[PDB]
Symmetry: C3
Subunit: 330 residues, 3 copies
């Protein structure tokens, strides 16, 4: 079968300050789920073997994809069977695919965990550690709850300054998932450059959650270190704890706290986000996100109101943001 699918998630959003201390408001996107358009298919080859493909790109409903539509979210071909699944092509790397599942705000909107970000202003295409070009991944079956994923992305001799392997990824995870309980440990290294100097991006991530039915609790710890070959490092420890709960048959409330300990500037930022999702149907929801981000000292982090304002703020400033929108899946 071949399936056309997508999501259009568009919102109004506001932040009280930008890099100049001025408020911003506007029409933005992707507050509850990332807006997307894709095609996927699966073919039974017999003998339990299946071939697949998946082409997916982000949608920007506020500007009609003004910078041009692509398939940067995923563009894979695969084989799958009793051995698991092997995929070739651009995709989420295994470490982000698995560990972002512990973020109650699904790595989008103003609310989400910010650990997967380019903390060091690395010069690679994907120094947020989320996706990779030139990726091969292998995902095992789940046996008795245990499951794992592994990926390698080729650098293809991409060269920036003294780095001649920019974009290489090697990484994977081990996990236990039984339904209500989930826990995962991810480890990855990317090759990059910072200021034209070869640098490793090392990331270790631990996540766990338990779904009690009446509520779900979820936590994530992560250390990301950009270690420059000649010496020096930009190290960040990121922490998150959240809870969600169904409210009355068609609603869901979510609350998440995060802390970002940015060692290179000896500064912390703390974040609290409250969210609500109200389902009008299985495919259509209204939602609201309210977030507060407190930078200390030299920290300049800003909330990610996509399509409105997602830059930084002045050092040590607190920022408040709101998003209210509709998400429609098809």
């Amino acid at each position: 079968s071949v399936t056309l699918f997508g999501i259009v998630d568009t919102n109004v959003a506001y932040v009280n300050k930008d890099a100049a201390g001025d408020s911003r408001y506007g029409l933005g996107t992707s507050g509850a789920s990332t807006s997307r358009l894709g095609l996927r298919g699966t073919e039974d080859l017999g003998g339990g073997l299946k071939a697949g493909f998946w082409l997916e790109g982000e949608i920007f409903g506020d500007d009609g994809n003004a910078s041009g539509f692509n398939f940067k979210r995923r563009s894979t071909v695969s084989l799958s069977g009793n051995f698991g699944e092997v995929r070739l092509g651009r995709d989420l790397v295994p470490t982000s695919q698995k560990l972002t599942s512990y973020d109650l705000f699904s790595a989008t909107g103003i609310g989400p965990f910010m650990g997967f970000r380019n903390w060091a202003a690395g010069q690679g295409a994907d120094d947020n550690g989320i996706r990779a070009n030139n990726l091969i991944s292998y995902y095992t079956p789940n046996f008795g709850g245990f499951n794992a994923g592994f990926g390698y992305a080729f650098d293809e001799k991409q060269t920036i300054g003294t780095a001649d392997s920019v974009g290489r990824y090697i990484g994977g995870y081990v996990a236990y998932d039984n339904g209500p309980l989930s826990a995962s440990l991810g480890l990855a290294q990317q090759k990059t450059a910072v200021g034209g100097l070869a640098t490793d991006r090392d990331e270790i991530t631990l996540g766990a959650s338990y779904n009690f039915g009446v509520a779900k609790l979820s936590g994530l710890l992560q250390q990301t270190k950009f270690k420059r070959d000649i010496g020096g490092d930009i190290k960040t420890n990121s922490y998150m704890l959240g809870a969600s709960a169904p409210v009355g048959g068609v609603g869901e409330v979510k609350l998440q706290y995060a802390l970002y300990d940015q060692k290179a500037i000896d500064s912390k930022a703390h974040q609290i986000t409250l969210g609500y999702v109200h389902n009008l149907s299985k495919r259509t929801a209204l939602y609201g996100n309210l977030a507060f981000l407190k930078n200390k000292d030299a920290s300049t982090l800003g909330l990610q109101a996509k399509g409105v304002y997602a830059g930084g703020v002045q050092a040590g400033e607190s920022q408040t943001g709101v998003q209210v929108g509709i998400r429609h899946a098809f």
Copy 2:
């Protein structure tokens, strides 16, 4: 339901002069309808409420969309019901959506009304007054013929020179539509800049038509004023009258006259366009457009032979153009 749809409209076209006085001919597009590719869907949410989405982009069949496919024609999500319809996302603004309906050449090809154009070389993304980014619109039901539409597009602090609200749109229309008779009054203001100086783009548009069955008569008047905050204005009055008629069961003839009174250069341009559409089926037509554009004095307007030549001509020159093509809808 989700519907894939589109139009491929490709033509041969000719103009007798360009900005150097040389003829041009070629393979162009979109002479009878704008070529497009889109997806749209509607979901019944119960209780008379519906959710929708619509993603549509222009097609350029002469070059395979060489500059890259996007969804700039419309990228909305909506809710609709007995209250009307609310849409979020890039789209036609209500004033252009409603008032371009009075142009017998459908705001495309060499023939159409040129009132919705960037008369002042405004620096905004959409200073032709046709579409807007970051748009929210509301369309009422039609009650007893009466209907209205309203839109607001956020500027998001887009800054060019002394303008810090570039791209803002506020506008709407009131109308009467009973089938044979249609009349509408539109009013809109956009924020922009001209030469780096903050400028309002003010537009008032009146249109009416009557469909007698054997023929249709249609007219449009418009004043567009770019009023610069420090003083000065580029004002243009635009007028059009046209008629169409079915010819023999599968044909249609169209004739339209327009005048553009460009106050800032004390010059007028007059235009006459004759068109014919021959239906081979409900979805496939052959067509021809013949146009004559007479610039007086300092006027340099040119016919819009998309994909062939759509620039200006030398001051005071007359230009003739022809387009012959096929339009295929799917």
Copy 3:
């Protein structure tokens, strides 16, 4: 009917040297068939007349179409019937459409015939002689084996230096095709520029093949001359002979030899490619290509490992390449 179709063909690839003499390896694409995504449709208009359209673009699975999706492979509208077929829009020109059919590696991957390439560093959009913007083509029916195709692409006064008709194409072919036997003669001229000086790109191509069932033999000869108006020429004679055979019910082996006699640098390059395709189903195949390219003297040609390395090599160097991949059609 309207049909969505495509191919995702992604591979691992290696070449032993690049322009610096270093090996390269990576995740690439399109080793067995060019990866693509398209929509096409046909409408019966009655009386044996049909309207069609076809929109197709290349897919780059290794990077998610990072530079943006388009319809550059084909974006046509057509009419067809007992007279043949007329198409308007960007497409393969008739000479490449017909003559590339003699290449056993289908003008893609490391293995294919390289005759359709920009031998002179022409400055036109399509100086490889493969596709054209602004194209009108006519294809006859096949009567008693005989068939022909003709195309004209408008230049639209595209100007580069002293060339004011850049991109013009005039060309066509005559052929005999009866099933097992195929032979074709193509002739074409394009207008271009080299170093800002007007230049004709003249191409004559002869191809033939015979399919014995147990094996197929195929050959191609081509002369491409870039003849500069003020004098001088970059002339290349290109030759290829290949064979293919089914192996055991789901396999196919292919072997092709080519020679490129580059007169402007008095140098030859020779190429040998071995390929295997193993079908897992009618739509899904695994494949491998192994190629050896020997440059003599000043020749610097390189193998085309798309998405890994497709540049040149140092003068007189031999290069080896390998591609192993999966092709999945839908």
